[PDB]
């Protein structure tokens, strides 16, 4: 009763047109905002043995875990299998192998191999996620080819190959207090929807964070490794873990007259939707970004946005290219003297199921949400925004089968938001795990699509709140709560 009246006030106040107030009211109950919960504990070991007798194959850039994990494992009565990095692909007997571990043929070659010993892993463990992340291109590379292109060549190629009619995946990287692995965390979101298109792979997601004064030793990683054997993501410390699950959020924002905001993939859907939203809100100056050149359309929406009092330019950038995104924050600074604000919108959809998707598909998905919003923040860093906002998905947390590499990419924003506080960037750092809008089987579910007011208000509140990352879900209160149970 509240709430519609609360509305009423809005559209007479007239923030709202009448009909805006009808559409949000229609939305009611509806339209709730999540924010990860974490439940900690006290980590007490286990047995050191998988629970079934059967092959363990283990990925290492290296072979610090070699001996660690025979010396665990001394006993255990099945094959041992130790892959590490080498220029070529080559059987080292008896269990050893090196290959290029971004090389599918290599991944075949492996497979082919294990085959004709009649060798079918159960327990598989990828562990070649390491290093620092750094907002460098080089850097940037490593780290995917160390997770989620090695991952995509070994999902590929094990199915491919039917190796594993069944496998348990335990993908682990390090991290450390003080840092953060926006890249290493998101595969979290890949694996996931690994697990939903062969759900007789089951996929676990490790990290092994040190912490100041209490390394993680390689036995204690073995430790963990036992553990997760005996027991999708866990933050393990050496004396403490933690698990993460949506929960509602527990119980005002506006761009500012002269503000001067970016919208990537302001021509889009959700991009064009909020730059109107804006240019209501306040005489601002909006610069809408895009690959494409001008067209009619373009003009169009630029005509639409100064009708309701912006100033409003179209400035064709790829923003996955770091000097294209560079010289865009350039030009808008000597364009207009400086930049308050960034919605990051851009983005693309191409679902395809891992065993039809191509290195080159995952390359052009994540291209904007993983170099994009590096290149943005990076090329960003001396403005004094207001508000840093990336539109990431709900398959980042709930993907459908067909979106890995799309799931990978929105969760990386989500993580990136650490990266902003770690660095103390200025202003308000979000990404919004937005679901399907009605604006630009689900049915079953007892879900439905966001409605263009629902999800504006939804940004609203978004805004005002205190989380760096929320998830916006549409559709009835308790079949949501099963949902993410
Ligand atoms: N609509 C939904 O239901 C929904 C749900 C969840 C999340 N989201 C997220 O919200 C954002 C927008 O969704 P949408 O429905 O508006 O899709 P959309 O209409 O395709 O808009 C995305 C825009 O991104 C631009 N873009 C792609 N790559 C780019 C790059 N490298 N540099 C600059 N611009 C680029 C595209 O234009 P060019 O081809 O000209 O570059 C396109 O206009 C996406 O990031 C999406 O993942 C949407």
């Known amino acids: 009763?509240?709430?519609?009246?609360?509305?009423?006030?809005?559209?007479?106040?007239?923030?709202?047109?009448?009909?805006?107030?009808?559409?949000?009211?229609?939305?009611?109950?509806?339209?709730?905002?999540?924010?990860?919960?974490?439940?900690?504990?006290?980590?007490?070991?286990?047995?050191?043995?998988?629970?079934?007798?059967?092959?363990?194959?283990?990925?290492?850039?290296?072979?610090?875990?070699?001996?660690?994990?025979?010396?665990?494992?001394?006993?255990?009565?099945?094959?041992?299998?130790?892959?590490?990095?080498?220029?070529?692909?080559?059987?080292?007997?008896?269990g050893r192998f090196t290959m290029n571990f971004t090389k599918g043929e290599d991944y075949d070659a492996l497979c082919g191999v294990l085959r004709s010993q009649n060798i079918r892993p159960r327990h598989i463990i990828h562990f070649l996620a390491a290093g620092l992340f750094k907002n460098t291109e080089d850097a940037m590379r490593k780290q995917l080819n160390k997770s989620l292109y090695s991952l995509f060549q070994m999902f590929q190629a094990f199915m491919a190959n039917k190796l594993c009619p069944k496998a348990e995946i335990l993908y682990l990287y390090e991290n450390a207090e003080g840092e953060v692995q926006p890249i290493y965390n998101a595969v979290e979101s890949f694996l996931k929807t690994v697990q939903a298109e062969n759900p007789?792979?089951?996929?676990?997601?490790?990290?092994?964070?040190?912490?100041?004064?209490?390394?993680?030793?390689?036995?204690?990683?073995?430790?963990?490794?036992?553990?997760?054997?005996?027991?999708?993501?866990?933050?393990?410390?050496?004396?403490?873990?933690?698990?993460?699950?949506?929960?509602?959020?527990?119980?005002?924002?506006?761009?500012?007259?002269?503000?001067?905001?970016?919208?990537?993939?302001?021509?889009?859907?959700?991009?064009?939707?909020?730059?109107?939203?804006?240019?209501?809100?306040?005489?601002?100056?909006?610069?809408?970004?895009?690959?494409?050149?001008?067209?009619?359309?373009?003009?169009?929406?630029?005509?639409?946005?100064?009708?309701?009092?912006?100033?409003?330019?179209?400035?064709?950038?790829?923003?996955?290219?770091?000097?294209?995104?560079?010289?865009?924050?350039?030009?808008?600074?000597?364009?207009?003297?400086?930049?308050?604000?960034?919605?990051?919108?851009?983005?693309?959809?191409?679902?395809?199921?891992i065993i039809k998707k191509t290195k080159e598909s995952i390359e052009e998905v994540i291209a904007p949400k993983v170099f994009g919003t590096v290149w943005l923040d990076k090329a960003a860093e001396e403005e004094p925004l207001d508000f840093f906002v990336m539109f990431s998905s709900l398959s980042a947390v709930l993907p459908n089968a067909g979106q890995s590499d799309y799931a990978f990419a929105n969760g990386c924003m989500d993580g990136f938001t650490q990266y902003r506080s770690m660095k103390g960037r200025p202003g308000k750092t979000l990404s919004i795990n937005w679901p399907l809008w009605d604006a630009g089987a689900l049915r079953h579910a007892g879900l439905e699509l966001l409605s263009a007011q629902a999800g504006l208000a939804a940004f609203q509140d978004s805004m005002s709140r205190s989380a760096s990352q929320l998830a916006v879900i549409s559709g009835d209160k308790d079949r949501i709560s099963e949902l993410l149970s």
């Open 200 to 353: 007789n792979f089951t996929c676990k997601a490790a990290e092994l964070k040190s912490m100041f004064d209490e390394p993680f030793t390689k036995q204690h990683i073995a430790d963990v490794i036992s553990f997760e054997w005996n027991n999708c993501f866990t933050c393990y410390e050496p004396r403490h873990y933690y698990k993460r699950q949506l929960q509602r959020v527990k119980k005002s924002f506006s761009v500012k007259k002269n503000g001067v905001y970016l919208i990537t993939g302001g021509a889009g859907g959700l991009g064009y939707l909020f730059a109107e939203y804006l240019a209501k809100q306040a005489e601002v100056k909006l610069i809408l970004t895009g690959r494409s050149p001008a067209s009619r359309e373009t003009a169009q929406k630029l005509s639409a946005l100064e009708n309701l009092g912006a100033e409003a330019l179209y400035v064709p950038a790829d923003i996955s290219k770091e000097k294209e995104t560079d010289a865009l924050i350039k030009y808008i600074k000597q364009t207009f003297g400086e930049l308050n604000g960034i919605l990051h919108s851009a983005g693309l959809v191409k679902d395809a199921f």
């Open 1 to 94: 009763t509240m709430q519609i009246e609360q509305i009423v006030k809005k559209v007479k106040e007239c923030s709202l047109t009448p009909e805006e107030g009808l559409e949000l009211i229609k939305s009611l109950g509806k339209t709730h905002l999540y924010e990860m919960v974490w439940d900690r504990h006290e980590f007490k070991g286990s047995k050191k043995f998988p629970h079934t007798k059967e092959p363990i194959l283990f990925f290492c850039e290296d072979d610090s875990m070699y001996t660690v994990m025979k010396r665990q494992l001394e006993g255990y009565e099945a094959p041992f299998i130790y892959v590490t990095s080498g220029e070529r692909f080559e059987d080292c007997r008896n």
